[PDB]
Amino acid sequence: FPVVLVINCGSSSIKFSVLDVATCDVLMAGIADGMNTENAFLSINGDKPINLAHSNYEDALKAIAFELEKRDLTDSVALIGHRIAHGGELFTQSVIITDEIIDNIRRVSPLAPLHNYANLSGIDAARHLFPAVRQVAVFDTSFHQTLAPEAYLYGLPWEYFSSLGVRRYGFHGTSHRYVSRRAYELLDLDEKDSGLIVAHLGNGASICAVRNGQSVDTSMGMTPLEGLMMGTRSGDVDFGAMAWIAKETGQTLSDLERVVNKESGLLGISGLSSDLRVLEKAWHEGHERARLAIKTFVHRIARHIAGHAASLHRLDGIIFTGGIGENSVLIRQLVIEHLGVLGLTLDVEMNKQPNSHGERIISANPSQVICAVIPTNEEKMIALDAIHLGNVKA
């Protein structure tokens, strides 16, 4: 009864999970937070902030390693899946990790300095701790590599693209991919003849147009900062304004890069919270700035949903996913009501249902386009790749 160990080794943490190969169900999950700080802890199932203070990425993973052995599931780990933030133009699909692949990840790493160098740290660690174990890299950008130049080029000097690799990459590729695969079953569509928009709304937020099973457009850019307005991230912003602000407040780009990433978005407008639940209640309690934050949030989701639909021959579906997309009844309704131009009719009792109801249509029958909610499962998608890649002869 073998298992896959999935690992998202970020800058501050190491979010892991263990899935059963047979059923892809989660047998174990955890998180080694406070990494690089003296105050570092490991909490399995959120049950006991352990002692792991002032420890590095490889120690954290060894801590988790010993905890896997403690639950007699070390000699059952057939596959290790690694989440990588950024794949540049080198990675178009998931791959078995080898020395070539490390080099290649290390080459594209400058495109995402924070995250990738931590992902690499996780890979070196895992490979030390599990050397007989097949390991796999899954890239958050690779699903979007089917985009055409017209879709991914910026309007900058060509040199910036060809010399420096400055172009739209897009993120949430694993989610957009998984959700879309699931969409074909739930809507009874033909992958080869279909057009979906997937609104992944969570932590970060991005839209993705999926034509005939392929990503043809996505809202995030070279960095995860483009596109939708998010929790603390600004989303789309007139560079003229950012330039003007610099000259008016006497701030740097480093200053403004913080502001746009950390003090902006839902938080920036509301001046209250990045959390929708807080703001949704804030609006119900009559806070105007919370109302505006949500209305703006909703407005920009609509704008990009409709826009991404231009990259489709036919619009068969809109699929909400992620923490916000799976759980926010209001946001889903406001967004759908903002797309009446596309002929969307919502079913409110169906949209009322909580996330317990899982993969579910939320549109009435008169609706010209089907709306649905499909819980994302990035870990399951990572496993399914790892499983598939397990059959390979290297």
**Residue ranges at the known binding site:** 8, 15, 83, 172, 200-204, 275-277, 323-327, 378
Tell the smallest beta-carbon distance from residue 340 to a second copy (Å). Answer: 6
CB closer to a second copy out of 132 and 241:
241
Tell the smallest beta-carbon distance from residue 120 to a second copy (Å). Answer: 19
Q: Which strands, in side-by-side order, build the sheet including 195-201?
A: 214-218, 205-211, 195-201, 317-321, 370-373, 360-361
CB closer to a second copy out of 61 and 228:
228
Tell the smallest beta-carbon distance from residue 311 to a second copy (Å). Answer: 8
Residues composing the chain: 394
Distance CA 310, CA 303 (A): 11
Is the distance from CB of 369 to CB of 317 less than 8 angstroms?
A: yes
Give Cα separations from 234 to 204, 246, 261, 262 (angstroms): 11, 16, 7, 9
Tell the smallest beta-carbon distance from residue 92 to a second copy (Å). Answer: 20
List the catalytic residues. 140
Distance CA 248, CA 357 (A): 51
Distance CA 344, CA 54 (A): 53
Tell the smallest beta-carbon distance from residue 210 to a second copy (Å). Answer: 13
CB closer to a second copy out of 56 and 162:
162
Provide CB contacts within 8 A for 122, sequence distance 6+: 7, 9, 14, 57, 61, 82
Q: Which residues are annotated as a binding site for substrate?
A: 83
CB closer to a second copy out of 133 and 237:
237
Is the distance from CB of 236 to CB of 300 less than 8 angstroms?
A: yes
Q: Which residues are annotated as a binding site for ATP?
A: 8, 15, 172, 200-204, 275-277, 323-327
Tell the smallest beta-carbon distance from residue 178 to a second copy (Å). Answer: 24
Provide CB contacts within 8 A for 297, sequence distance 6+: 228, 229, 266, 331
User: Which residue type is seen at 59?
Assistant: D
CB closer to a second copy out of 242 and 350:
242
Provide CB contacts within 8 A for 65, sequence distance 6+: 74, 129, 130
Q: Which strands, in side-by-side order, build the sheet including 26-33?
A: 41-44, 26-33, 15-20, 3-8, 77-84, 134-139, 95-96
Provide CB contacts within 8 A for 160, sequence distance 6+: 154, 166
Backbone angles phi, psi at 79, to 5 degrees: -140, 145
Q: Which residues are annotated as a binding site for Mg(2+)?
A: 8, 378
CB closer to a second copy out of 70 and 314:
314
Say which DSSP state 309 is in.
G
Say which DSSP state 346 is in.
B
